[PDB]
């Protein structure tokens, strides 16, 4: 017993600085106009703006009919930005969020908005909480239905660079994929007994999954429906993971409950723990990298971690 028992090695540098936002509401999403100017959104109609790359954030309160909205998603492409939330709401800007307008949503939308993606120049795509997919090309005046066959309330949803999506079923029994041209989601059975929690895309054309009990896997490069070995980054089942994101093609971060944050420098094969952030009293729900030297992790109760290059 000459090395610490049951642990994984501790990372040599902690790049994450903890920030307390001027709120205790949960933050759900973030998007940048450029390197310095960006927006974040969350629960209770929370909206904040940064002009310094996300070091400091200023609350903005829109005078809406009520403040119970859960702002689920924000997306900018240059100065054009969009926010969606539940109960159904859509906000739009063309000036970097200096003025926002509410876009009326068709009451026949199946489910409430879950995700919006700005495509620039008046175009955007929206997905509802039950997987209906719509696109606008005219700044939200008209929406074309791409998928109307609903799939139940998705547990998680992620997008690839080419506009594919992957959605985990409500209770993690299976997952579904969609790409442009398809008229419905395609279901795929899970490949572990443990239920799926989250799935997304790697920067090399594969899928990743997080499953119950702190395990992860990656799809086969030759066949995205074949899956590799089930990995245990923390060598245990007690700590669940919530999100996985790549800073670079080889450097991967894995965020989970109760201060858990791990990094792999070999593409996800082996992991080391960022022990400094174990002191932060928060689950780490979402990792957002905007470039290799700008990134954020969403905690609870207004906690943010901000990436600071060594």
């Amino acid at each position: 017993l000459s090395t610490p028992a049951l642990a994984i090695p501790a990372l040599d540098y902690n790049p994450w600085e903890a920030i307390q936002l001027p709120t205790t509401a949960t933050i759900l999403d973030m998007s940048f106009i450029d390197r310095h100017h960006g927006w974040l959104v969350g629960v209770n109609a929370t909206l904040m703006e940064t002009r310094d790359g996300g070091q400091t954030w200023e609350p903005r309160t829109l005078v809406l009919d009520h403040s119970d909205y859960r702002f689920n998603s924000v997306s900018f492409q240059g100065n054009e930005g969009w926010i969606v939330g539940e109960p159904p709401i859509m906000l739009h800007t063309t000036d970097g969020g200096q003025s926002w307008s509410q876009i009326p949503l068709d009451p026949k939308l199946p489910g409430s908005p879950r995700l919006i993606k700005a495509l620039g120049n008046g175009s955007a795509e929206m997905i509802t909480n039950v997987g209906a997919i719509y696109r606008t090309k005219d700044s939200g005046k008209n929406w074309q239905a791409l998928v109307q066959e609903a799939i139940g309330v998705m547990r998680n949803l992620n997008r690839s660079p080419s506009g594919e999506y992957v959605a985990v079923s409500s209770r993690g029994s299976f997952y579904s994929t969609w790409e442009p041209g398809q008229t419905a989601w395609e279901p795929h059975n899970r490949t572990t007994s443990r239920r799926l929690h989250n799935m997304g895309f790697t920067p090399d054309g594969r899928l990743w999954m997080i499953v119950n009990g702190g395990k992860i896997a990656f799809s086969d490069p030759d066949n995205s429906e074949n899956w590799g070995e089930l990995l245990s980054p923390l060598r245990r089942n007690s700590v669940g993971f919530l999100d996985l994101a790549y800073r670079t093609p080889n450097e991967v971060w894995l965020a989970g409950g109760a201060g858990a944050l791990l990094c792999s420098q070999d593409g996800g094969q082996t992991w080391q723990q960022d022990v400094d952030v174990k002191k932060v009293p928060s689950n780490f729900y979402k990792i957002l990298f905007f470039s290799p030297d700008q990134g954020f992790i969403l905690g609870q109760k207004g906690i943010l971690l901000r990436y600071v290059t060594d």
Partner: peptide, 6 residues
């Protein structure tokens, strides 16, 4: 018409 800030 655009929204007000509080």
């Amino acid at each position: 018409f655009p929204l007000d800030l509080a």
